[PDB]
Write a protein that binds this ligand. Structure first.
Ligand SMILES: [Ca+2]
Ligand SMILES: [Ca+2]
Ligand SMILES: [Ca+2]
Lengths: 41, 263, 49, 52, 41, 49, 105, 53, 41
């Protein structure tokens, strides 16, 4: 399953927008938006 | 990123507006409660103030707040930022002008913050009530209960299609910049301030200056002074005087929009 | 009737034309401060609930 | 400084005055007539009501 | 009157002189209200 | 439920100002004469009464 | 307002035994059901603006000590006029009332 | 003796158990209010928690 | 507005007693009783 161009897809077919990644929040159930491979913290 | 939300909030500044019962005699406070919204289904409310939370002079930091004492915008670490109604509420988040807190029912709304030995309190009279969900009138959300659809204010700052407008600030009147030089009053204009004046000492002597301009009149009580700072913008409160000419229709998102949740 | 059900009427939730009579009356500011006070009847939709 | 109530809605009729009142605090309404007998009324209004 | 050429008199009652740029500014400067009239549209 | 928004008032405080009729639901205008407000840092303008 | 050597409005004095101590006012709190905001203090008297409730308690921190005293007095809110408000409004009608004076004289 | 009231309490430890509403979102906390008892006659209550005092 | 021997007049018919002068409280809108010259501070 692919979302739109303005959505970042974490896992399990639930996608959050590109403005919502790397911002110290849990917007996905797997915490892929604040992982070490994207933010690089 | 943090700066995606904080982009248009870097372009605005705090302000000092009228607050009733700031201390005991309705002074002008750096933090001023305007438009507290209390129609959610668990006692959570969203309060809008005049201070700026989570924003320094450079960058963004979630533990620092910014306010004004006169004309100098002062940043200070958040230590004890309290919101209380009749018991001390527990706040949830803060972003820009807006605070979020989960309050017990009551009749007042109080905010405050310490910087040194100062207090800086404001108390508005808004009837906030606890609204239960369903066919039972409970007084606090329970440990275990049947899930039902309740409408609440969201935990996350984002655009979400709700906008408020910022405006170019009008003339702000300052009297501490008018001093007598030897026997004639002198205007102190700091750093491109474009200080206005209006003298009626024998007659009208109005004009706009940019530096010095030693006025050839006698008393400091017969001449008014202003200050034109257009670098940063402000939300057009009802407690601030408007600008002279056309003012641009800015945009600013509201962080904690109402959503639908489960209670 | 400003207090029962049609204080605010809108044809669609995203519509641009609004009907609103809430008996909004302005009031004189007092004692030399800049603020805008007003008086109006409460919302009838909140009363209908 | 004391509060000010919202303005009531006046509806006229043949020898009848109809008042729709929507208070936000418990608010007092007292009437009288300017004849030989005043016939006074006095009541506290807490809820939105209607009197004739 | 008989002012300089860069200034225009106001009122014509007390013979008071003002600069030309204070036209329709919204402030009642002179005793007579001729300074707030005949401004540009 | 409605939400009444208030724009910033103008203070032309040596003279008088008038408004047009903007198209807005339940729009209100008034002019109050001789207020003499007091902001922070002294009074707003010199013209008394 | 007294520090056993003169007059200073940031000071207080009390007795712990037979020795009359004197400290600086650090945390002088008055609460009824919610914390009140006090107005002035002069000698034996404290002026404060309190919400309604059934108890009145004041206290002051000497060092790490507490020094609390809670009396049982019923204090109410008394509005002025023909509307029963529960907190004084921002705007409205100016009406004559009767309140304790700010000034010490 | 003060030590007589703590002979069986040295063998116990605190624990972390869940409790609703630490802040906003029902934490797991060292303090966990269990079995508040309020059947006295002057508003004096006894609160059992998970921490050790 | 000539007041008595035990009253101090601030400005424009405003009289307060002499004990109310220079006592860290503004009893007049003129603020003459707590000014820089009258108090001497
Ligand atoms: Ca995120
Ligand atoms: Ca002019
Ligand atoms: Ca005095």
């Amino acid at each position: 399953p692919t979302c739109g161009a303005h959505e970042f897809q974490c896992s399990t077919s639930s996608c959050i927008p590109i403005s919502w990644v790397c911002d110290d929040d849990a917007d996905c159930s797997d915490q892929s938006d604040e992982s070490l491979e994207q933010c690089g913290r | 990123d943090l700066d995606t939300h904080f982009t248009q909030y870097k372009l605005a500044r705090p302000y000092i507006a009228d607050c009733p019962n700031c201390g005991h005699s309705r002074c002008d406070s750096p933090i001023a409660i305007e438009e507290v919204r209390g129609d959610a289904h668990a006692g959570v409310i969203r309060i809008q103030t005049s201070a700026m939370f989570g924003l320094k002079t450079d960058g963004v930091d979630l533990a620092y707040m910014s306010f004004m004492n006169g004309k100098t915008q002062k940043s200070i670490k958040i230590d004890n930022l309290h919101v209380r109604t009749s018991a001390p509420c527990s706040l949830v988040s803060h972003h820009g002008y807006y605070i979020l807190a989960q309050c017990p029912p009551g009749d007042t709304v109080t905010v405050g913050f310490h910087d040194g030995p100062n207090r800086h309190t404001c108390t508005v009279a808004h009837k906030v009530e606890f609204r239960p969900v369903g066919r039972e009138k409970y007084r606090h959300p329970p440990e275990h209960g049947v899930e039902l659809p309740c409408n609440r204010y969201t935990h996350k700052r984002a655009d979400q299609g709700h906008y408020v407008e910022m405006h170019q600030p009008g003339l702000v009147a300052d009297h501490s910049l008018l001093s007598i030089h030897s026997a004639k009053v002198k205007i102190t204009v700091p750093s491109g301030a474009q200080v206005k004046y209006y003298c009626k000492c024998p007659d009208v002597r109005k004009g706009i200056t940019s530096s010095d301009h030693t006025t050839t009149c006698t008393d400091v009580k017969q001449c008014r002074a202003y200050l034109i700072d257009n670098k940063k913008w402000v939300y057009n409160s009802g407690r601030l005087p408007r600008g002279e000419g056309d003012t641009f229709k800015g945009k600013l998102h509201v962080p904690f929009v109402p959503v639908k949740a489960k209670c | 009737k400003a207090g029962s059900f049609g204080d605010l009427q809108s044809r669609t939730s995203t519509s641009n034309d609004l009907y609103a009579n809430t008996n909004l009356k302005l009031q004189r500011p007092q004692a030399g401060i800049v603020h805008t006070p007003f008086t109006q009847v409460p919302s009838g939709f909140e009363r209908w609930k | 400084i004391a509060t000010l109530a919202p303005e009531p809605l006046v509806e006229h009729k043949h020898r009848t005055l109809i008042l729709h009142l929507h208070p936000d605090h418990p608010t007092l309404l007292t009437t009288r007539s300017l004849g030989s007998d005043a016939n006074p009324t006095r009541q506290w209004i807490e809820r939105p009501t209607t009197v004739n | 009157r008989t002012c300089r050429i860069h200034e225009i008199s106001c009122g014509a009652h007390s013979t008071q002189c003002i600069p030309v740029s204070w036209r329709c500014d919204g402030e009642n400067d002179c005793d007579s209200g001729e300074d707030e009239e005949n401004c540009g549209n | 439920k409605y939400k009444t928004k208030v724009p910033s008032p103008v203070v032309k405080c040596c003279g008088a100002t008038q408004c047009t009729s903007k198209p807005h639901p339940d729009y209100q205008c008034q002019v109050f004469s001789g207020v003499y407000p007091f902001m922070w840092g002294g009074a707003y303008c010199f013209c008394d009464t």
